[PDB]
Structures are given as C-alpha cells and as structure tokens.
Amino acid sequence: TGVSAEAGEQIFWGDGQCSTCHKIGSSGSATRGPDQEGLAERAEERAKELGLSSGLEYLVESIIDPEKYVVEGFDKIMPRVYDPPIMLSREKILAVLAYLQSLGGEPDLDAIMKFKDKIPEASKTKVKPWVPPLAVTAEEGEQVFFDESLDVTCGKCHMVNGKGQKVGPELTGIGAIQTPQYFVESILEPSAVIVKGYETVFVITADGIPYNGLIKSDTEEELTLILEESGSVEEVVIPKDEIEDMKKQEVSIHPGNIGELLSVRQFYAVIEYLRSLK
C-alpha cells in the first residue's frame, strides 16, 4: 500500500499490531503502551532530551530498538515488529512512520525514505527458530494452562477466548504479538515487565490494616483489590474513606515460583500454547 500516512494508519490499526497496545486519544482502548495522541510533538521533545537529530529519528529508534529508551511509567514490553511473530515489512514500517508524524505533525516522506537503510527487513530476520528441548504441542499446553489440579493454574488468573478467570490480562491474541522469549520471562521473571494497570499497590487503612494486591476496580466509594498467596487469589473491598495511604509497587501478583511448580514438559507446552494464540 506504499509509504503514505494513509497506508500507515491502516497498518497501525491492523497488521502492525500497534493498536493492541497504543490508543490515540478516544480512539482505541489499549493501555499497555502510551497514548500516541500528540506523538509527533512529543518526539521532537524526546529527541532534544536524547541528543538525537530530529523527532523522526526518535520515532525510528522507537521501532527499531524499543528497549533503547523506555518511556517513563512503562516497562520493556514493546516487541521488535520486524522480527517474529509480527514480521512487519520494511515498506509497512516506513508507512507507519509517516502515520506517526501525522499525529500532530506533518509527514516528511523524503526524510522517512532516507531511514530505509536502518529498518531491518522482516524476511531477513536473524531470530532463530524456537525449538523446545522435548516434543510438545499447543493443545498439550492448553490443557496445562487450565488444569486446576496443578500447583499453578494459569487460567485462575488469565482468560483466553472466554475461558478462565480475570486477574491478570486476557491473553487472547498474544501469540500474534509477543516472542517466546517474552513468554519465558513473563512466566519465570514476572516482575521484570509489569503490564500497565496490573501493578501491585500497598494500601494502609486508618485502622492500620495493610493490604497488598492489584486493583480490580476503583469506584468513588470502594477500592477492590485482588490479593495473592501461594497461587490462590482473594478479593477485598476497602472503603475509600478508610484509606490512609496507597502506593504502586513495581511487583507482580503473577507468582514468582513457577519454575518450581511446572515440569520441563509442562513449561514448554504452555509456551507453545501461548505462541498459538493468534
């Protein structure tokens, strides 16, 4: 569809997967990444802070090396979209850059095209095939994911296509977006990346009672938390008028001991299941 902001808009909201994490003002509802309304002017400010040549250069860097600068208040969750699974082509990345410049600015197509030689070509990805060390399948991993007889049951906290229970985020579609490495880290190192909105808070009430958990809901009169202990979860409803302090902690309720609770087979099967969630 060429290199035009119009093409880029279709890709951002489509096969680039950008809108699965980013909203633009009142368009979209995704929150895993920052709202991109006003991004073109923000990029000019980022480039100044970072000693880059232009806002455009910051936008390019943000796609080609997402980890190089991490927006405050977010973790290293954005994938390299020119690598698997997304495998977004170079022409589509150039188009998306034109779209990003249109978010409060003016696309500069000649300037974008000069960055072509810095954008990796998806077909030339250097990522190696994911090969688990024993034979596992996605269907086997689905069984593990929902198995309530294990010492961890992913489905107690994550929904897929209407199955499971919501504590952490819904995982439907994540295999179209994320890498097996991100799945490994998410399972075994849960606090390395905290999905936005799923932070643990530490609350203290006026009566001196502590509660540490994630926020399920937050109304004008009640804060509902989900607490976790030994893989089980529990709700508590705290009257807002009784809250003395609340602080976000960079820690996850996803358990930290899954490497002790899943066999090698179960673990690699679950990864294959996650990859399959297109």
Ligand code: HEC
């Ligand atoms: C969720 C898994 C994401 C996907 C898919 C995409 N992005 Fe993203 N992006 C995400 C986060 C959490 C962050 C902030 C942390 C960081 O890496 O800096 C970003 C950031 C950006 C930025 C910078 C925004 C800023 O305010 O400075 C840009 C320009 C950006 N992301 C672009 C972008 C595009 C075009 C995507 C589709 C090809 C895309 N992102 C996907 C999370 C996620």
Ligand code: HEC
């Ligand atoms: C509730 C006590 C949980 C259990 C059991 C499991 N997960 Fe979890 N997970 C939970 C939360 C609250 C969060 C968000 C905060 C964070 O740590 O990032 C997560 C996150 C993930 C992710 C990342 C999702 C994303 O959108 O990027 C993945 C891939 C994930 N969790 C996988 C997963 C698996 C496979 C589990 C069973 C072995 C599992 N989780 C259990 C909460 C809880």
Ligand SMILES: [Ca+2]
């Ligand atoms: Ca970044």
Ligand SMILES: [Ca+2]
């Ligand atoms: Ca995590």
Ligand SMILES: [Ca+2]
């Ligand atoms: Ca009140």
Ligand SMILES: [Ca+2]
């Ligand atoms: Ca209790």
